[PDB]
């Protein structure tokens, strides 16, 4: 039902398992236990990743889809997180 994703600075993000599976990496890691550590992703990035999971699930097979806001100054970190997570 829920999984816990732990950022490099120790914040714990508790997310619906179905939403976390947006990440190919999380899916493979969970294939059982429900906790995953991301020792190279800080909480200001992982929090945004979790918002993406929610948004991705809510708007799949959508009508016009609202913008996912990404400030330029975190775009590169977000990209590297999304590379690692495969989402």
């Amino acid at each position: 039902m829920y999984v816990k994703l732990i950022s490099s600075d120790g914040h714990e993000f508790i997310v619906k398992r179905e939403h976390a599976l947006t990440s190919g990496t999380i899916k493979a890691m969970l294939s059982e236990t429900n906790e995953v550590n991301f020792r190279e992703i800080p909480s200001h990035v992982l929090s945004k990743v979790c918002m993406y999971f929610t948004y991705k699930v809510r708007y799949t097979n959508s009508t016009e889809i609202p913008e996912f806001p990404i400030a330029p100054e975190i775009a590169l970190e977000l990209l590297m997180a999304a590379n690692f997570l495969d989402c």
Binding site: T60, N61, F68, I70, P72, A75, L76, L78, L85, C87
Partner: peptide, 16 residues
């Protein structure tokens, strides 16, 4: 229609 993956969205945030 589904949202683009986050890899592509993060790229567009700097490319466009």
């Amino acid at each position: 229609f589904s949202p683009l993956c986050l890899r592509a969205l993060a790229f567009c945030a700097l490319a466009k």
